[PDB]
Amino acid sequence: PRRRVVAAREILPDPKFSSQTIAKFMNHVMQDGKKSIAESIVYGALERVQEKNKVDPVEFFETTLEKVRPMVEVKARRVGGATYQVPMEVRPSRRTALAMRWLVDAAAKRSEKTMALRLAGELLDAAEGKGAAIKKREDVH
Amino acid sequence: KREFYEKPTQERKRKKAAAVK
Amino acid sequence: TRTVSEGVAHIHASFNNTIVTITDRQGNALAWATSGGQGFRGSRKSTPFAAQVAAEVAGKAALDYGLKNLDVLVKGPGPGRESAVRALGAVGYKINSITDVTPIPHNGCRPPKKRRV
RNA sequence: AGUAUGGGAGAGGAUGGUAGAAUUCCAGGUGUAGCGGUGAAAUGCGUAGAGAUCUGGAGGAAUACCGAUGGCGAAGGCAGCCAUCUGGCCUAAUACUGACGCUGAGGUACGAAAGCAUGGGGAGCAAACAGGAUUAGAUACCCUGGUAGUCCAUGCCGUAAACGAUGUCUACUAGCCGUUGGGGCCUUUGAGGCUUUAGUGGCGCAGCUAACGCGAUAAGUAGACCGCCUGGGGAGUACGGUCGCAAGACUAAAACUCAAAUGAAUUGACGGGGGCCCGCACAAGCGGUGGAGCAUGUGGUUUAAUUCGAUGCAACGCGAAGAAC
Ligand SMILES: [Mg+2]
Ligand SMILES: [Mg+2]
Ligand SMILES: [Mg+2]
Ligand SMILES: [Mg+2]
Ligand SMILES: [Mg+2]
Ligand SMILES: [Mg+2]
Ligand SMILES: [Mg+2]
């Protein structure tokens, strides 16, 4: 827009846990409007990480998601034909989006039977520090 | 560094004419 | 090796390339670094992003002597003139003085012609 | 109109001496792999030792701030500092000669830069020239080297948008705001304020002009003298003549051809002219095409025909909402 800005769209929280972060994660996982399979995947992964260490899912989920969250990003700004790559400030929403994307790709490229089990495994590996999603996130780069 | 053998008189006269107004 | 610890800095700044040399007060050179050794190899050598890295590499190479007394001299205009002292402070050197010492001629020789485009 | 006396300002001119910054080169100390350049590269330089820094010398040119709405000069033009010679201008009134004045065809003097002749000098810059790029082509703009020249002394040349595109001299005709050199008055009470001259700027009444504009520094109202113009091109050209070492300069037509060439202003249109704004136009996000197989339309080739149209966006699953007869 050029004249006036538009307000961001707000999403309703999920029916199961009443958390908006879980809803946004399911929206990021969902493809072609198939919300049911995404909900099944997310709920299965949440329960799988829950019964391994008995803590309610939303606490562990947010605490682990904050771990892989980045702080700044670098885009190219052309001035004299060069990249001149430098970091820039970003809002928390852009960081949460990048974290969710990196996590859902790292869990996807893993090898297991179903999407729920590999998602739970990737969540645990990123939580205790054995994950590759935190490896994609680099400080100096 | 460059030279403008003719130009500085024109340039300063434009300078003063534009500064007075 | 020497460790007199009063080495001066000569930050030559030009539109095409920037040069920084670390030498003592008398003038005997100690260590130098340039954007040529950096590896941009072109017009990007003029960017201020290379000047700071050149200055920091010069400072790391000089600290082997034990440099902490800084006498900086900047000559010539262009970008990257201010980034060198910024990086040299970022590594943590103590400052004695900063001043501008670029030479302007008192009616020197005839300059080249104007580039029309 | 001019002379003598006492004061003032100034890059006015000629000659000589002297100072600093900066560029180039010659070494010397340490150090040394890149340096230089363009929108992008290369020509070019460097491991013999590059570039940067410091110290000592050699040479040439120009005088950074001061510097200005300046100042001086008939014009061209004149800027570091000091010394010598010299021209002009402004300012106060006392005396002095008493029209001794203005202009001026021929003539004569000076006259930017470039160019020419003789003898030196040559740091930087740079016609011609060489190489590397870009372009379909580059002979040029761009980059790297570089000779005449730019500098000095003695002469020639006598041309410029040599412009204020406005000849010299004299007298008269509303105002407002600045500046430079003098003189006078008021409380030099303080760089202050008010009037008078000689220069230099910005608005503006009357008036003038086709308009733009000028407007006490007239392009206003008047007088004296000189130069110059009579549609565009041919043409400031041919011939003749004068001057010059040369380049060339001055004076200066005709035949022929056209019915236009021009000045100022008005409305559109355009601008790789400057500002302003909008658009799923850019930035962010999701999903595609361009790659594979098939359906469909078009261009090409073949055939007896492969019926005819639509052809950048705005033609190509378009006329055709449906060709086995
Ligand atoms: Mg006369
Ligand atoms: Mg003439
Ligand atoms: Mg004339
Ligand atoms: Mg007027
Ligand atoms: Mg002639
Ligand atoms: Mg295809
Ligand atoms: Mg057809």
Coordinates of C-alpha atoms (C1' of nucleotides) and ligand atoms in Angstrom, one line a residue:
Chain A
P1 CA 0.0 0.0 0.0
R2 CA 1.0 3.6 -0.6
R3 CA -1.5 5.7 1.2
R4 CA -2.6 3.9 4.4
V5 CA -1.4 0.7 6.1
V6 CA -3.7 -2.3 6.8
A7 CA -4.0 -4.1 10.1
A8 CA -2.6 -7.6 10.5
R9 CA -5.1 -10.5 10.4
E10 CA -5.7 -12.2 13.8
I11 CA -6.3 -15.9 14.0
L12 CA -8.6 -17.7 16.5
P13 CA -6.9 -20.0 19.0
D14 CA -7.0 -23.7 18.6
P15 CA -10.0 -25.5 20.2
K16 CA -7.9 -28.2 22.0
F17 CA -5.4 -26.1 24.0
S18 CA -6.7 -22.5 23.4
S19 CA -3.2 -21.4 22.1
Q20 CA -2.7 -19.1 19.1
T21 CA 0.9 -20.3 18.6
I22 CA -0.3 -23.8 18.0
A23 CA -2.9 -22.4 15.5
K24 CA -0.3 -20.5 13.6
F25 CA 2.0 -23.6 13.5
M26 CA -0.9 -25.7 12.1
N27 CA -1.5 -23.0 9.5
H28 CA 2.1 -23.1 8.5
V29 CA 2.1 -26.9 8.3
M30 CA -1.2 -27.0 6.4
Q31 CA -1.1 -27.4 2.6
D32 CA -3.9 -27.1 0.0
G33 CA -6.4 -26.3 2.7
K34 CA -6.1 -29.8 4.3
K35 CA -6.4 -28.6 7.9
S36 CA -7.5 -32.0 9.3
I37 CA -4.2 -33.8 8.4
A38 CA -2.2 -30.9 9.8
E39 CA -4.2 -31.0 13.0
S40 CA -3.6 -34.7 13.3
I41 CA 0.1 -34.4 12.7
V42 CA 0.5 -31.5 15.2
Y43 CA -1.6 -33.2 17.9
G44 CA 0.2 -36.5 17.5
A45 CA 3.6 -34.8 17.7
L46 CA 2.6 -32.9 20.7
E47 CA 1.4 -36.0 22.6
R48 CA 4.5 -37.9 21.5
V49 CA 6.8 -35.2 23.0
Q50 CA 4.5 -35.0 26.0
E51 CA 4.5 -38.7 27.2
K52 CA 8.3 -38.9 26.8
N53 CA 8.6 -36.2 29.5
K54 CA 5.4 -35.5 31.2
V55 CA 5.0 -31.7 30.7
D56 CA 1.9 -30.1 29.2
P57 CA 2.5 -29.5 25.5
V58 CA 2.2 -25.7 25.1
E59 CA 4.9 -24.9 27.7
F60 CA 7.5 -27.2 26.1
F61 CA 6.4 -26.1 22.6
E62 CA 6.9 -22.4 23.2
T63 CA 10.1 -22.9 25.2
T64 CA 11.6 -25.0 22.4
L65 CA 10.3 -22.7 19.6
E66 CA 12.0 -19.7 21.3
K67 CA 15.3 -21.6 21.2
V68 CA 15.5 -21.8 17.4
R69 CA 14.2 -18.3 16.9
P70 CA 16.6 -16.0 15.0
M71 CA 17.4 -12.4 16.0
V72 CA 18.4 -10.6 12.8
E73 CA 18.4 -11.2 9.0
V74 CA 20.5 -10.0 6.0
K75 CA 19.0 -8.9 2.7
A76 CA 21.0 -7.5 -0.3
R77 CA 20.7 -3.7 -0.9
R78 CA 22.1 -2.6 -4.3
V79 CA 24.1 0.6 -4.1
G80 CA 27.0 0.3 -6.5
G81 CA 26.6 -3.1 -8.1
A82 CA 27.6 -5.0 -4.9
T83 CA 25.7 -7.0 -2.3
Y84 CA 27.1 -5.1 0.7
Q85 CA 25.4 -7.6 3.0
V86 CA 24.5 -6.2 6.5
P87 CA 22.0 -7.2 9.2
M88 CA 18.7 -5.4 9.8
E89 CA 16.2 -5.3 12.7
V90 CA 13.1 -7.4 12.5
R91 CA 9.9 -7.7 14.5
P92 CA 9.2 -10.9 16.6
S93 CA 6.5 -12.1 14.1
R94 CA 9.0 -12.3 11.2
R95 CA 11.3 -14.3 13.5
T96 CA 8.6 -16.7 14.7
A97 CA 7.7 -17.3 11.0
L98 CA 11.3 -18.1 10.1
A99 CA 11.6 -20.4 13.1
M100 CA 8.4 -22.2 12.2
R101 CA 9.5 -22.6 8.6
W102 CA 13.0 -23.9 9.4
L103 CA 11.5 -26.3 12.0
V104 CA 8.8 -27.7 9.6
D105 CA 11.4 -28.2 6.8
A106 CA 14.0 -29.8 9.1
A107 CA 11.3 -32.2 10.5
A108 CA 10.2 -32.9 6.9
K109 CA 13.6 -34.0 5.5
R110 CA 14.1 -36.4 8.5
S111 CA 13.6 -40.1 8.0
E112 CA 10.9 -41.9 10.0
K113 CA 7.6 -43.7 9.4
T114 CA 5.1 -40.8 9.5
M115 CA 5.2 -37.1 9.7
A116 CA 4.0 -36.9 13.4
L117 CA 6.8 -39.1 14.7
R118 CA 9.6 -37.3 12.7
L119 CA 8.1 -34.0 13.8
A120 CA 8.3 -35.1 17.5
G121 CA 11.8 -36.3 17.0
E122 CA 12.9 -33.0 15.4
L123 CA 11.2 -31.1 18.2
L124 CA 13.1 -33.1 20.8
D125 CA 16.4 -32.8 19.0
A126 CA 16.0 -29.0 18.7
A127 CA 15.0 -28.8 22.4
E128 CA 17.9 -30.7 23.9
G129 CA 20.2 -29.3 21.3
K130 CA 20.8 -32.3 18.9
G131 CA 18.6 -30.8 16.2
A132 CA 19.6 -29.5 12.7
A133 CA 17.0 -26.7 12.7
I134 CA 19.2 -24.9 15.3
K135 CA 22.1 -25.7 13.0
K136 CA 20.4 -23.8 10.1
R137 CA 20.2 -20.8 12.4
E138 CA 23.7 -19.3 12.6
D139 CA 24.9 -16.3 14.6
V140 CA 27.6 -14.8 12.4
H141 CA 26.1 -15.6 9.0
Chain B
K1 CA 41.0 18.1 -9.5
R2 CA 40.0 19.9 -12.7
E3 CA 40.2 23.4 -14.2
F4 CA 37.5 25.7 -15.6
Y5 CA 39.6 28.7 -16.9
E6 CA 36.5 30.5 -18.1
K7 CA 33.9 29.4 -15.6
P8 CA 34.7 30.8 -12.1
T9 CA 33.8 34.4 -12.9
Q10 CA 30.4 33.2 -14.3
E11 CA 30.0 30.9 -11.3
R12 CA 30.7 33.6 -8.7
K13 CA 28.5 36.1 -10.5
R14 CA 25.7 33.6 -10.5
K15 CA 26.5 33.0 -6.8
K16 CA 26.2 36.6 -5.8
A17 CA 23.1 37.2 -8.0
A18 CA 21.4 34.2 -6.5
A19 CA 22.4 35.0 -2.9
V20 CA 21.2 38.7 -3.1
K21 CA 17.7 37.6 -4.1
Chain C
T1 CA 60.1 -7.9 18.9
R2 CA 60.8 -4.2 19.1
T3 CA 58.0 -3.3 21.6
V4 CA 58.7 0.5 21.7
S5 CA 54.9 0.7 21.6
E6 CA 54.4 4.1 20.0
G7 CA 53.5 3.1 16.4
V8 CA 51.7 5.6 14.2
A9 CA 48.9 4.9 11.7
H10 CA 48.7 6.2 8.1
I11 CA 45.1 5.8 6.8
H12 CA 45.4 6.8 3.1
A13 CA 41.9 7.1 1.7
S14 CA 41.1 7.4 -2.0
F15 CA 38.0 7.0 -4.1
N16 CA 39.3 3.9 -5.8
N17 CA 41.2 2.2 -3.0
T18 CA 42.1 2.7 0.7
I19 CA 45.5 2.0 2.2
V20 CA 46.5 1.8 5.9
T21 CA 50.0 1.3 7.1
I22 CA 51.3 0.9 10.7
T23 CA 54.7 2.4 11.3
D24 CA 56.6 4.0 14.2
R25 CA 56.9 7.7 15.0
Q26 CA 60.1 8.0 13.0
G27 CA 58.6 6.4 9.9
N28 CA 60.2 2.9 9.7
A29 CA 57.4 0.6 8.5
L30 CA 56.1 -2.1 10.8
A31 CA 53.1 -3.8 9.0
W32 CA 50.6 -2.8 6.3
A33 CA 47.4 -4.2 4.9
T34 CA 45.4 -3.3 1.8
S35 CA 42.1 -4.1 0.1
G36 CA 44.2 -5.8 -2.6
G37 CA 45.1 -8.6 -0.2
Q38 CA 41.5 -8.6 0.9
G39 CA 40.1 -10.3 -2.3
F40 CA 37.3 -8.1 -3.6
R41 CA 39.4 -7.3 -6.7
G42 CA 37.5 -4.4 -8.3
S43 CA 35.4 -1.4 -7.5
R44 CA 34.2 -3.1 -4.3
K45 CA 37.7 -2.5 -2.8
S46 CA 36.6 1.1 -2.4
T47 CA 33.7 0.1 -0.2
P48 CA 34.0 1.1 3.5
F49 CA 33.3 -2.6 4.4
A50 CA 36.8 -3.5 3.2
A51 CA 38.6 -0.6 4.9
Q52 CA 37.6 -1.7 8.4
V53 CA 38.8 -5.3 7.8
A54 CA 42.1 -4.0 6.4
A55 CA 42.6 -1.8 9.4
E56 CA 41.8 -4.7 11.8
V57 CA 44.2 -7.1 10.0
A58 CA 46.8 -4.4 10.2
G59 CA 46.2 -3.9 13.9
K60 CA 46.4 -7.7 14.6
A61 CA 49.6 -7.9 12.7
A62 CA 51.0 -4.9 14.6
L63 CA 50.1 -6.0 18.1
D64 CA 52.8 -8.6 17.7
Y65 CA 55.0 -5.6 18.2
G66 CA 52.9 -4.4 21.1
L67 CA 51.2 -1.3 19.6
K68 CA 48.9 0.6 21.9
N69 CA 49.9 4.3 21.2
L70 CA 48.0 5.5 18.2
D71 CA 48.8 8.4 15.9
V72 CA 46.3 8.3 13.0
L73 CA 46.6 10.4 9.8
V74 CA 43.9 10.4 7.2
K75 CA 44.6 11.8 3.7
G76 CA 42.3 12.2 0.8
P77 CA 38.5 12.1 0.5
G78 CA 36.2 9.2 -0.3
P79 CA 34.3 6.5 1.5
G80 CA 35.9 4.3 4.0
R81 CA 37.9 7.2 5.6
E82 CA 36.0 6.9 8.9
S83 CA 35.5 3.2 9.1
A84 CA 39.2 2.4 9.7
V85 CA 39.4 4.3 13.1
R86 CA 36.0 2.8 14.0
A87 CA 37.4 -0.8 13.6
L88 CA 40.7 0.2 15.2
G89 CA 38.6 1.3 18.2
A90 CA 36.4 -1.8 18.0
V91 CA 39.5 -4.0 18.5
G92 CA 40.2 -1.8 21.5
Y93 CA 43.2 0.4 20.9
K94 CA 43.8 3.5 23.1
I95 CA 43.8 6.8 21.2
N96 CA 46.3 9.6 21.5
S97 CA 44.9 11.9 18.8
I98 CA 42.7 12.1 15.6
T99 CA 43.2 14.9 13.1
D100 CA 43.0 15.6 9.4
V101 CA 46.3 16.1 7.5
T102 CA 45.3 15.9 3.9
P103 CA 47.5 18.2 1.7
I104 CA 45.8 20.9 -0.3
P105 CA 48.2 22.7 -2.8
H106 CA 48.7 26.4 -2.8
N107 CA 48.1 26.9 -6.6
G108 CA 49.9 23.8 -7.8
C109 CA 50.3 22.5 -11.3
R110 CA 47.5 22.4 -13.9
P111 CA 44.9 19.7 -13.1
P112 CA 43.6 17.3 -15.7
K113 CA 40.6 18.3 -17.9
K114 CA 37.0 17.6 -16.8
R115 CA 35.4 14.3 -17.7
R116 CA 32.4 15.2 -19.8
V117 CA 30.6 12.0 -18.9
Chain D
rA1 C1' 37.8 73.8 -20.4
rG2 C1' 42.9 74.1 -18.2
rU3 C1' 47.2 75.4 -14.4
rA4 C1' 49.7 75.8 -8.9
rU5 C1' 49.2 74.6 -3.8
rG6 C1' 47.7 70.7 0.5
rG7 C1' 45.4 65.4 1.1
rG8 C1' 43.1 60.0 -0.4
rA9 C1' 42.1 55.1 -2.6
rG10 C1' 43.5 51.4 -6.0
rA11 C1' 45.3 43.1 -8.9
rG12 C1' 47.2 50.7 -13.5
rG13 C1' 52.3 49.8 -16.2
rA14 C1' 57.8 48.4 -16.8
rU15 C1' 62.4 46.4 -14.3
rG16 C1' 64.9 43.6 -10.4
rG17 C1' 65.2 40.6 -6.0
rU18 C1' 62.9 37.1 -2.7
rA19 C1' 59.2 33.2 0.1
rG20 C1' 55.8 29.0 1.0
rA21 C1' 52.5 25.1 -0.3
rA22 C1' 51.9 21.4 -4.1
rU23 C1' 53.3 18.0 -8.7
rU24 C1' 57.6 15.2 -11.2
rC25 C1' 62.5 13.0 -10.9
rC26 C1' 67.1 11.5 -8.2
rA27 C1' 68.9 8.6 -4.5
rG28 C1' 68.6 6.7 1.2
rG29 C1' 66.0 4.1 5.9
rU30 C1' 62.1 0.3 7.0
rG31 C1' 58.6 -2.4 4.5
rU32 C1' 56.8 -5.1 0.2
rA33 C1' 52.4 -8.3 -3.1
rG34 C1' 49.8 -6.1 -5.6
rC35 C1' 49.3 -0.9 -7.8
rG36 C1' 46.5 2.2 -11.4
rG37 C1' 41.7 2.9 -14.0
rU38 C1' 36.1 2.5 -15.8
rG39 C1' 28.9 1.9 -15.7
rA40 C1' 32.1 -3.2 -16.4
rA41 C1' 37.4 -4.6 -18.1
rA42 C1' 42.0 -4.2 -20.6
rU43 C1' 46.1 -1.6 -22.5
rG44 C1' 50.1 0.2 -18.3
rC45 C1' 53.5 -0.4 -13.7
rG46 C1' 55.8 -4.1 -10.0
rU47 C1' 59.5 -9.6 -6.6
rA48 C1' 65.6 -6.1 -10.7
rG49 C1' 61.9 -4.7 -6.2
rA50 C1' 55.5 -2.3 -6.6
rG51 C1' 51.8 1.2 -3.8
rA52 C1' 52.0 4.1 1.2
rU53 C1' 55.6 6.8 5.1
rC54 C1' 60.0 9.5 6.6
rU55 C1' 64.7 12.4 5.5
rG56 C1' 68.0 15.3 1.7
rG57 C1' 68.4 17.5 -3.1
rA58 C1' 67.1 19.5 -8.7
rG59 C1' 64.1 21.9 -11.9
rG60 C1' 59.6 24.3 -14.1
rA61 C1' 54.8 26.8 -13.7
rA62 C1' 51.1 29.2 -10.6
rU63 C1' 50.2 32.5 -6.1
rA64 C1' 45.4 28.4 -1.6
rC65 C1' 42.4 31.8 2.9
rC66 C1' 42.1 37.3 2.5
rG67 C1' 38.4 37.5 -2.3
rA68 C1' 33.7 41.0 -2.0
rU69 C1' 26.9 42.8 -4.5
rG70 C1' 34.9 44.5 -4.8
rG71 C1' 39.0 48.0 -7.0
rC72 C1' 42.0 50.0 -11.2
rG73 C1' 42.5 50.6 -16.7
rA74 C1' 40.2 54.0 -23.3
rA75 C1' 39.6 48.8 -24.8
rG76 C1' 42.3 44.0 -24.6
rG77 C1' 43.1 43.3 -19.4
rC78 C1' 45.4 43.3 -14.2
rA79 C1' 46.0 39.1 -7.6
rG80 C1' 52.2 35.9 -3.0
rC81 C1' 56.0 39.8 -0.6
rC82 C1' 59.7 43.9 -1.2
rA83 C1' 62.7 47.9 -3.8
rU84 C1' 63.3 51.7 -8.2
rC85 C1' 61.0 54.5 -12.3
rU86 C1' 56.2 56.1 -14.1
rG87 C1' 50.6 57.2 -15.9
rG88 C1' 45.6 58.3 -14.6
rC89 C1' 41.4 59.4 -11.0
rC90 C1' 38.9 61.5 -6.5
rU91 C1' 38.7 65.5 -2.9
rA92 C1' 38.4 71.5 -0.1
rA93 C1' 38.6 76.6 -2.1
rU94 C1' 42.3 80.4 -3.0
rA95 C1' 44.5 82.5 -7.0
rC96 C1' 45.5 82.3 -12.1
rU97 C1' 44.9 82.5 -18.5
rG98 C1' 40.1 83.8 -20.3
rA99 C1' 36.1 80.0 -25.1
rC100 C1' 41.8 78.1 -25.3
rG101 C1' 35.6 73.5 -26.6
rC102 C1' 32.8 68.8 -28.9
rU103 C1' 33.1 65.4 -32.9
rG104 C1' 36.1 63.9 -36.5
rA105 C1' 36.4 61.2 -43.4
rG106 C1' 41.8 60.0 -44.6
rG107 C1' 46.0 58.7 -40.8
rU108 C1' 48.1 56.8 -36.6
rA109 C1' 48.8 54.0 -31.6
rC110 C1' 47.3 49.9 -28.6
rG111 C1' 44.9 45.4 -29.2
rA112 C1' 42.5 38.0 -25.7
rA113 C1' 43.7 33.2 -27.5
rA114 C1' 45.6 30.5 -31.4
rG115 C1' 49.7 30.8 -35.3
rC116 C1' 54.8 32.2 -37.5
rA117 C1' 60.8 33.6 -37.0
rU118 C1' 65.4 33.5 -34.1
rG119 C1' 68.0 31.6 -29.2
rG120 C1' 67.0 29.2 -24.5
rG121 C1' 63.8 26.2 -20.9
rG122 C1' 60.5 22.2 -20.3
rA123 C1' 57.8 20.3 -13.8
rG124 C1' 52.3 19.6 -14.7
rC125 C1' 48.6 19.8 -18.7
rA126 C1' 48.0 18.6 -23.7
rA127 C1' 46.5 19.3 -30.7
rA128 C1' 48.7 15.3 -34.0
rC129 C1' 50.1 10.0 -33.0
rA130 C1' 50.1 4.7 -30.6
rG131 C1' 47.4 1.0 -27.8
rG132 C1' 42.8 -1.1 -24.7
rA133 C1' 37.3 -0.8 -24.4
rU134 C1' 31.7 0.2 -26.4
rU135 C1' 28.9 0.1 -30.9
rA136 C1' 26.3 -3.5 -36.8
rG137 C1' 30.2 0.0 -37.9
rA138 C1' 34.1 4.2 -33.7
rU139 C1' 37.4 7.2 -37.5
rA140 C1' 34.9 10.4 -31.2
rC141 C1' 33.0 10.7 -26.2
rC142 C1' 36.0 6.6 -21.9
rC143 C1' 41.2 4.7 -20.1
rU144 C1' 46.8 4.4 -20.6
rG145 C1' 51.5 7.0 -22.9
rG146 C1' 52.8 11.3 -25.5
rU147 C1' 55.4 15.5 -29.7
rA148 C1' 54.5 20.8 -31.2
rG149 C1' 52.2 24.4 -27.7
rU150 C1' 51.5 26.4 -22.9
rC151 C1' 57.1 29.6 -20.1
rC152 C1' 61.3 33.5 -21.2
rA153 C1' 64.0 37.7 -24.5
rU154 C1' 63.6 40.2 -29.4
rG155 C1' 59.9 40.8 -33.8
rC156 C1' 55.6 39.6 -37.1
rC157 C1' 50.4 38.5 -37.5
rG158 C1' 45.7 42.4 -36.3
rU159 C1' 41.5 38.4 -35.8
rA160 C1' 37.0 36.9 -31.4
rA161 C1' 29.6 36.0 -28.9
rA162 C1' 36.8 41.9 -29.0
rC163 C1' 28.8 41.8 -25.9
rG164 C1' 25.9 46.2 -22.1
rA165 C1' 24.7 42.3 -29.2
rU166 C1' 23.2 49.6 -26.8
rG167 C1' 29.0 55.3 -30.9
rU168 C1' 31.2 60.2 -28.4
rC169 C1' 29.6 64.9 -25.9
rU170 C1' 25.9 68.2 -23.5
rA171 C1' 21.2 69.8 -20.7
rC172 C1' 16.3 68.5 -18.4
rU173 C1' 12.6 65.0 -16.3
rA174 C1' 8.6 61.0 -9.5
rG175 C1' 10.3 57.7 -5.7
rC176 C1' 12.4 53.1 -2.5
rC177 C1' 16.6 49.7 -0.9
rG178 C1' 22.4 48.4 -0.8
rU179 C1' 27.9 49.3 -1.7
rU180 C1' 33.0 51.8 -2.9
rG181 C1' 36.4 56.8 -2.5
rG182 C1' 36.0 61.8 -0.4
rG183 C1' 33.6 66.5 2.0
rG184 C1' 29.9 68.9 5.5
rC185 C1' 26.3 68.9 9.9
rC186 C1' 24.1 66.9 14.4
rU187 C1' 25.1 64.8 20.9
rU188 C1' 33.1 61.9 17.9
rU189 C1' 27.6 61.2 23.5
rG190 C1' 29.3 54.7 20.7
rA191 C1' 31.4 51.1 14.4
rG192 C1' 25.8 56.3 15.3
rG193 C1' 22.2 59.4 12.4
rC194 C1' 21.2 63.4 8.3
rU195 C1' 22.6 65.9 3.6
rU196 C1' 26.6 66.9 -1.1
rU197 C1' 29.7 64.8 -5.0
rA198 C1' 32.4 61.1 -8.2
rG199 C1' 31.8 55.2 -9.5
rU200 C1' 29.2 50.6 -9.1
rG201 C1' 23.9 47.3 -8.2
rG202 C1' 18.3 45.7 -7.3
rC203 C1' 12.7 47.4 -8.0
rG204 C1' 9.6 51.1 -10.0
rC205 C1' 5.7 56.5 -11.8
rA206 C1' 5.3 59.4 -16.2
rG207 C1' 7.2 58.4 -21.1
rC208 C1' 8.9 55.0 -25.1
rU209 C1' 8.4 50.0 -27.6
rA210 C1' 5.5 45.0 -32.1
rA211 C1' 6.5 42.5 -27.7
rC212 C1' 10.2 41.2 -24.3
rG213 C1' 11.6 45.2 -21.6
rC214 C1' 14.4 50.3 -20.7
rG215 C1' 13.2 53.6 -17.1
rA216 C1' 18.9 59.9 -13.7
rU217 C1' 24.3 54.3 -15.8
rA218 C1' 17.2 55.4 -20.7
rA219 C1' 16.0 52.0 -25.1
rG220 C1' 12.4 59.2 -22.0
rU221 C1' 12.3 64.7 -23.8
rA222 C1' 16.2 67.8 -27.1
rG223 C1' 21.0 69.5 -29.7
rA224 C1' 26.4 68.7 -32.4
rC225 C1' 29.4 65.2 -35.2
rC226 C1' 30.9 60.4 -37.2
rG227 C1' 30.0 55.1 -38.8
rC228 C1' 26.4 51.8 -40.8
rC229 C1' 21.3 49.1 -43.4
rU230 C1' 17.7 48.6 -47.7
rG231 C1' 14.3 40.5 -49.0
rG232 C1' 17.0 35.0 -48.3
rG233 C1' 21.0 32.3 -50.7
rG234 C1' 25.1 33.0 -53.9
rA235 C1' 28.9 35.8 -50.2
rG236 C1' 32.1 38.6 -46.7
rU237 C1' 32.7 34.9 -52.3
rA238 C1' 35.4 35.6 -57.5
rC239 C1' 38.7 39.5 -60.1
rG240 C1' 41.7 43.7 -59.2
rG241 C1' 44.6 46.4 -55.4
rU242 C1' 47.3 47.2 -50.3
rC243 C1' 49.9 44.7 -46.2
rG244 C1' 52.4 40.0 -44.4
rC245 C1' 57.9 35.0 -44.2
rA246 C1' 53.6 32.2 -44.3
rA247 C1' 48.8 31.2 -42.5
rG248 C1' 46.0 35.0 -44.2
rA249 C1' 43.9 40.2 -43.2
rC250 C1' 41.3 44.8 -45.5
rU251 C1' 38.4 47.0 -49.7
rA252 C1' 34.7 44.4 -52.4
rA253 C1' 30.6 42.6 -57.0
rA254 C1' 27.9 40.1 -60.7
rA255 C1' 25.4 36.1 -63.3
rC256 C1' 21.7 32.8 -61.2
rU257 C1' 17.6 30.8 -58.0
rC258 C1' 13.4 31.3 -54.4
rA259 C1' 8.4 33.7 -52.6
rA260 C1' 9.9 33.5 -48.7
rA261 C1' 13.8 34.0 -44.7
rU262 C1' 12.9 36.5 -39.9
rG263 C1' 11.7 38.9 -34.2
rA264 C1' 8.4 38.7 -29.9
rA265 C1' 4.4 36.4 -27.8
rU266 C1' -0.1 32.4 -27.6
rU267 C1' -2.6 27.2 -27.3
rG268 C1' -1.3 22.2 -27.7
rA269 C1' 2.3 18.0 -28.2
rC270 C1' 7.2 16.1 -26.7
rG271 C1' 11.7 16.0 -23.5
rG272 C1' 17.1 9.9 -21.8
rG273 C1' 14.3 18.5 -18.0
rG274 C1' 13.1 19.4 -12.4
rG275 C1' 9.2 18.6 -8.4
rC276 C1' 3.9 15.7 -7.0
rC277 C1' 0.8 11.4 -6.9
rC278 C1' -1.6 6.6 -8.0
rG279 C1' -1.9 1.5 -9.6
rC280 C1' -0.6 -6.5 -7.2
rA281 C1' 3.4 -1.4 -10.5
rC282 C1' 8.0 -2.4 -6.9
rA283 C1' 9.3 -4.9 -1.4
rA284 C1' 7.1 -9.5 1.7
rG285 C1' 4.3 -14.2 1.1
rC286 C1' 1.8 -18.5 -1.6
rG287 C1' 1.2 -21.1 -6.1
rG288 C1' 2.7 -21.5 -11.5
rU289 C1' 5.2 -21.0 -16.9
rG290 C1' 10.0 -21.7 -19.0
rG291 C1' 12.3 -28.7 -18.3
rA292 C1' 9.0 -34.0 -19.1
rG293 C1' 4.3 -36.7 -21.6
rC294 C1' -0.5 -35.4 -23.8
rA295 C1' -4.8 -31.9 -25.6
rU296 C1' -5.3 -27.2 -28.4
rG297 C1' -4.2 -22.6 -31.6
rU298 C1' -0.4 -20.2 -34.7
rG299 C1' 4.3 -19.7 -37.8
rG300 C1' 7.2 -22.6 -41.3
rU301 C1' 7.8 -27.1 -45.1
rU302 C1' 5.1 -30.7 -48.1
rU303 C1' 0.8 -31.7 -51.0
rA304 C1' -4.5 -31.8 -55.3
rA305 C1' -6.2 -28.9 -51.6
rU306 C1' -4.0 -28.7 -46.7
rU307 C1' -10.7 -22.9 -47.4
rC308 C1' -10.8 -17.5 -45.5
rG309 C1' -9.9 -14.2 -41.7
rA310 C1' -7.6 -12.1 -36.5
rU311 C1' -1.0 -10.5 -36.0
rG312 C1' 3.2 -5.9 -29.9
rC313 C1' 0.6 -4.8 -25.2
rA314 C1' -5.0 -4.8 -27.5
rA315 C1' -3.3 -12.1 -32.6
rC316 C1' -2.3 -17.3 -31.1
rG317 C1' -8.5 -23.0 -26.1
rC318 C1' -9.4 -16.2 -31.3
rG319 C1' -14.6 -15.9 -35.6
rA320 C1' -15.7 -21.8 -34.2
rA321 C1' -21.6 -22.4 -28.0
rG322 C1' -18.3 -28.3 -30.4
rA323 C1' -15.0 -30.3 -39.5
rA324 C1' -16.4 -38.8 -40.0
rC325 C1' -21.5 -37.3 -44.5
Ligands
MG1 MG 38.5 63.1 -31.8
MG2 MG 34.9 41.5 -36.5
MG3 MG 29.3 44.5 -33.3
MG4 MG 12.9 49.6 -13.9
MG5 MG 38.1 37.5 -48.6
MG6 MG 5.5 -27.1 -22.2
MG7 MG -5.1 -20.4 -40.8

